[PDB]
Amino acid sequence: FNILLATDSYKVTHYKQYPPNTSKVYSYFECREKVKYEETVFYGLQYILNKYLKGKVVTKEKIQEAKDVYKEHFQDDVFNEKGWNYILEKYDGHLPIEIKAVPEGFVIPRGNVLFTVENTDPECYWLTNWIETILVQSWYPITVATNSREQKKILAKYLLETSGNLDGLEYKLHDFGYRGVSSQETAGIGASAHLVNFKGTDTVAGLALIKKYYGTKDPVPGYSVPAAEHSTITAWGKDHEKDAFEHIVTQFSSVPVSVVSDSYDIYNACEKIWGEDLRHLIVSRSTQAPLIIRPDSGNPLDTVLKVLEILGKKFPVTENSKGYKLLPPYLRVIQGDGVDINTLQEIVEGMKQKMWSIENIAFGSGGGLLQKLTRDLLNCSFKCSYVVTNGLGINVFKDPVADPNKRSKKGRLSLHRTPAGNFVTLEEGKGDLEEYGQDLLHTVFKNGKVTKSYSFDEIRKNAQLNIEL
Amino acid sequence: FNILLATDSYKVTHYKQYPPNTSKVYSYFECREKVKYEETVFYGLQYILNKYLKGKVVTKEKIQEAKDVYKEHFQDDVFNEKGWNYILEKYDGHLPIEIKAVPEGFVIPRGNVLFTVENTDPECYWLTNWIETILVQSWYPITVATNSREQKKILAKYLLETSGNLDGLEYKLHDFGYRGVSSQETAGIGASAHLVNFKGTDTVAGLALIKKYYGTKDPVPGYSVPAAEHSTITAWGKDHEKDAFEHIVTQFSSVPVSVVSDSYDIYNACEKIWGEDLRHLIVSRSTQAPLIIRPDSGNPLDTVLKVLEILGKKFPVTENSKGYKLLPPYLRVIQGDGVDINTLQEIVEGMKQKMWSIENIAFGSGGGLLQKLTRDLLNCSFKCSYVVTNGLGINVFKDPVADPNKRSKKGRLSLHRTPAGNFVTLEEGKGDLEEYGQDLLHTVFKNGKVTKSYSFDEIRKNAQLNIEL
Numbered sequence A, B: 001f002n003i004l005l006a007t008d009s010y011k012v013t014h015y016k017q018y019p020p021n022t023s024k025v026y027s028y029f030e031c032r033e034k035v036k037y038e039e040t041v042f043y044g045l046q047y048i049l050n051k052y053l054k055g056k057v058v059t060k061e062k063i064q065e066a067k068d069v070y071k072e073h074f075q076d077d078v079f080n081e082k083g084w085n086y087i088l089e090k091y092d093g094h095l096p097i098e099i100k101a102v103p104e105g106f107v108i109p110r111g112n113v114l115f116t117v118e119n120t121d122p123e124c125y126w127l128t129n130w131i132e133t134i135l136v137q138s139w140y141p142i143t144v145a146t147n148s149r150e151q152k153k154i155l156a157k158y159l160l161e162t163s164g165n166l167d168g169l170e171y172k173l174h175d176f177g178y179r180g181v182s183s184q185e186t187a188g189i190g191a192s193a194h195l196v197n198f199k200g201t202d203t204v205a206g207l208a209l210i211k212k213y214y215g216t217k218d219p220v221p222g223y224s225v226p227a228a229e230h231s232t233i234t235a236w237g238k239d240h241e242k243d244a245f246e247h248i249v250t251q252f253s254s255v256p257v258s259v260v261s262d263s264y265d266i267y268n269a270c271e272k273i274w275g276e277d278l279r280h281l282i283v284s285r286s287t288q289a290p291l292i293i294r295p296d297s298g299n300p301l302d303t304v305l306k307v308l309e310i311l312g313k314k315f316p317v318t319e320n321s322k323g324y325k326l327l328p329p330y331l332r333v334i335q336g337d338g339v340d341i342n343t344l345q346e347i348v349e350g351m352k353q354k355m356w357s358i359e360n361i362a363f364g365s366g367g368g369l370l371q372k373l374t375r376d377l378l379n380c381s382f383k384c385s386y387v388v389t390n391g392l393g394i395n396v397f398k399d400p401v402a403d404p405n406k407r408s409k410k411g412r413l414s415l416h417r418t419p420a421g422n423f424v425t426l427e428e429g430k431g432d433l434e435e436y437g438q439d440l441l442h443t444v445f446k447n448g449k450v451t452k453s454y455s456f457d458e459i460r461k462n463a464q465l466n467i468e469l
């Protein structure tokens, strides 16, 4: 990895564009104000600091490689070789940057400063926004963690209403997204962001990322169970679906097992194969190791409701203390097709209307959880708010006439708790007046060193729901 | 990277689920039949084969690491240590897999086999679908390349209609997506997929990936120009926007320069600052080095039309041979906000209705180009179609009752030309009848080696538009 080749091309040319006599560029990240996504989980900067920004990130070889690439890419010599060589020679290739950030896992309303970046050497005024591109990719773990948390709020509301408690909430949304994301690196980052809120994942890449960059007291941060796929059912031949089911449940008789049941006819599988032919292998199972029937096609809500109606007629259903129907404890359902925050809401509301407890179900989400998200969802943005030119600080901002939502903050910023316990971003260096308590931004990176780190356990505690609290 | 930890968790348990005495699992990838996206660019498998699948990918240390993680992740011992040890011992950790694929850059209608995977050793029946997760991530470069090519078809239609030629087509959609994708790895993959169709990118990560995995005769596959961002304009102070513009155009007097003009008032900037105050610095520029004015906010079509109306009144507009208005050659526009395939269509049709040539404009697209895409767009899917159990080949498939779109192909597959020169996928080994000539798939991977490969130049030739041919 070469940090000189890890920026948007145009940023190579910006050192020639800033006002002459500029010694400081100070920039900030927010999820701009515009499911409403009123608050965001701050997560993932520590990964970026450690993997890409810390230590000796400039060498003679990286400077020459960048110079050679940019000569061809621009068909001109515009690269700031002198400025990068300055960092190599003066700081042994360590970036003269200070980053201050809200603690990871903090849940912050939209339109607040989450982190700030500034150069610590006047010669490196251009470096603050060089690293915008790398740092703005924090949008992704923020957005995954935030959208996963918003789904946890929906599950918590319906579980509480239909059962009176939150037991097993942290296992109710399982990551099925490894195949559906755009890269191996995205898989690890996204899976780790989902694990801020939940414990169930098949995206194995998330485990190694958490171990390397964050750390847990427990051996692993996420868990799974044996489960079939269409290949392990259909390989038996269509006439032998029952033989596949029997073999699989028997192989994993003492742990929970998920069995995809829609290869040919989900309704037949539930009513006749599970319901009658193999019923003796289901009713013998323990509470700790239930059979989890997995539909994977059709309208998500209609299919869940029809599967529950079938199973409720073939198995001994109880009524819990809230008046909701509960399958026996050896039998559960997972809906792992077509699940995103919108369809999750539709399914749990549909179940509540048909008097089915959310205790009966869990959800698998792949593309909806890890891929169907953009930087525009929370309006994640990085902008310069302060410069020093000719030794004088000036408050800098954009305010496009056709879009007031794109207006940016002015001056030096700080994040504070309000008297009512909410959050406020003070602009124009007004934090210096000390009318609002301590600034919540902490130095996390300075002059090539990570200065403050968070464990994954601390991040999970910070990101808890109020209902859990 | 550890390929043993690079699969969906449930696949760790599948070796125990296939029928006893299964010697072969044969699987295939397609963009299932369901802007219509009727044809897909096959691109990106070669990256995956080289980076993740070739050579010694199993070691004693990688087996022990996977064993230790899966013991905690499943809270049980289910990991196939013996199976992975067999590959390490017998094949020096090279995967006993054969992959056959359509040549990269090929443009193939939906619902055709694009690649097949099978084990070459009967002991490794379980390995075919272990690597589904890694291989299915090819959805991403396929989908970026396909959606980029569909935008090229729109630009080609309107450029031809308004100008009579395709001059500059390959520069008309520029990648601005580096900050808006989910990881560094995704940035390189997605940028490379856009460069199958276009030559303009700010996502520098794409260049290294292409050089390393594909190659080009030219020194670089993609190009950019100096350009401003809001920080380099706003840092001057709101009252000094003219000074910023003047400094920037003067710094890049002899190459094209893009200047974001919407920091405070895009209409004022065009009419008064560019139009009057700095007009003398614009009219003096060469055809090879125009000023490119960049709006970045407001309704994308309405803002482009108003910017063009303003500039047409301040600069000497001509009428081209098709009767469309053309700014002088020293002045162009780039719309780099809110561009996706839908808004691109809306803008070029709106320009045509107002008699503005598409010669006047280029587009920048970021999240729309590289991030706002999912595996569901082209229904990218990997399924088992053939197994050998007890020495007998079985044609296997899924056919869910509630969704006929999810039905999968049966048996051994091959790709052929029809008598009319179209594509057909033959099922159930019917390719062997030689009624449709030779299979168009080539072996690209066998027993740990990449056996056939494509330069980036060949991929570009394969992905050309008919209108270009």
Ligand SMILES: CSc1ccc(CNC(=O)[C@@H]2CCCN(c3ncnc4nn(-c5ccc(C)cc5)cc34)C2)cc1
Binding pocket: A167, A168, A169, A171, A172, A173, A174, A200, A224, A225, A256, A258, A287, A288, A289, A290, A292, A332, A333, A334, A359, A360, A361, A362, A363
């Ligand atoms: C489906 S509904 C269920 C399932 C299994 C069970 C068996 N019990 C377990 O697995 C342990 C112990 C008790 C708490 N607990 C869970 N509680 C509620 N719900 C859960 N769900 N899960 C889940 C597991 C695997 C996946 C892939 C997805 C979700 C796990 C859930 C995790 C009980 C209920």
Ligand SMILES: CSc1ccc(CNC(=O)[C@@H]2CCCN(c3ncnc4nn(-c5ccc(C)cc5)cc34)C2)cc1
Binding pocket: B167, B168, B169, B171, B172, B174, B200, B224, B225, B256, B258, B287, B288, B289, B290, B292, B332, B333, B334, B359, B360, B361, B362, B363
């Ligand atoms: C805006 S419209 C233009 C712009 C610049 C120019 C100056 N000319 C160039 O740059 C070379 C030589 C001639 C062909 N040629 C281009 N032709 C049409 N169109 C283009 N567009 N571009 C483009 C450049 C940079 C970006 C970031 C995006 C698009 C580049 C374009 C690339 C002419 C027309």
Ligand SMILES: NC(=O)c1cccnc1
Binding pocket: A175, A176, A177, A202, A227, A228, A258, A336, A364, A366, B008, B009, B010
């Ligand atoms: N465990 C599962 O059922 C699963 C995992 C990943 C994708 N789809 C299903």
Ligand SMILES: NC(=O)c1cccnc1
Binding pocket: A008, A009, A010, B175, B176, B177, B202, B227, B228, B258, B336, B364, B366
């Ligand atoms: N070159 C540009 O104008 C640019 C690049 C990346 C993102 N936004 C704008």
Ligand SMILES: [Cl-]
Binding pocket: A058, A059, A060, A061, A088
């Ligand atoms: Cl060095």
Ligand SMILES: [Cl-]
Binding pocket: A228, A229, A230, A260
């Ligand atoms: Cl599956």
Ligand SMILES: [Cl-]
Binding pocket: B228, B229, B230, B260
């Ligand atoms: Cl910009």
Ligand code: NA
Binding pocket: B058, B059, B060, B061
């Ligand atoms: Na070894």
